[PDB]
């Protein structure tokens, strides 16, 4: 199991608190720490960041859109 096939692609991320993101996945490590670019709030469609680092503890789901 690996997030390799998702690199540089757009993804949906569901956080553990049920919050939702849309972003380009650029980096990831073995603990699921993500490096993201052009992040948005799925529900809100509100631009969050041009670049952001997201802890794996926070992630519940990553989907390939």
């Amino acid at each position: 199991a690996t997030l390799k096939d998702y690199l540089n692609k757009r993804v949906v991320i569901i956080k553990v608190d049920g919050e939702c993101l849309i972003a380009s996945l650029n980096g990831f490590d073995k603990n699921t720490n993500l490096f993201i670019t052009n992040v948005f709030n799925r529900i809100s469609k509100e631009f969050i960041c041009k670049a952001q680092l997201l802890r794996g503890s926070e992630i519940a789901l990553v989907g390939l859109i």
Partner: protein
Amino acid sequence: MLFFSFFKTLVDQEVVVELKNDIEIKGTLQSVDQFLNLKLDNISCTDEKKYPHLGSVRNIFIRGSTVRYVYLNKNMVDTNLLQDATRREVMT
């Protein structure tokens, strides 16, 4: 290492996954890892309400720490194999 072994024999078999945050997802198990992370292909909706905000997404990665349940079919699994393997496993 035992449940990693279990989940490998389930590849290509449709499973339902229940995440802690009350999300339920049907999918074909494409991939499993040491943390029990899961990759599900051909995503589909089991429950109307619990199911989250997806659509085009047909392939997902699920973090193993966030799953509560994986619902299986009794024909996907040899019970006696499971039992004798648990008996073999050492816990110390």
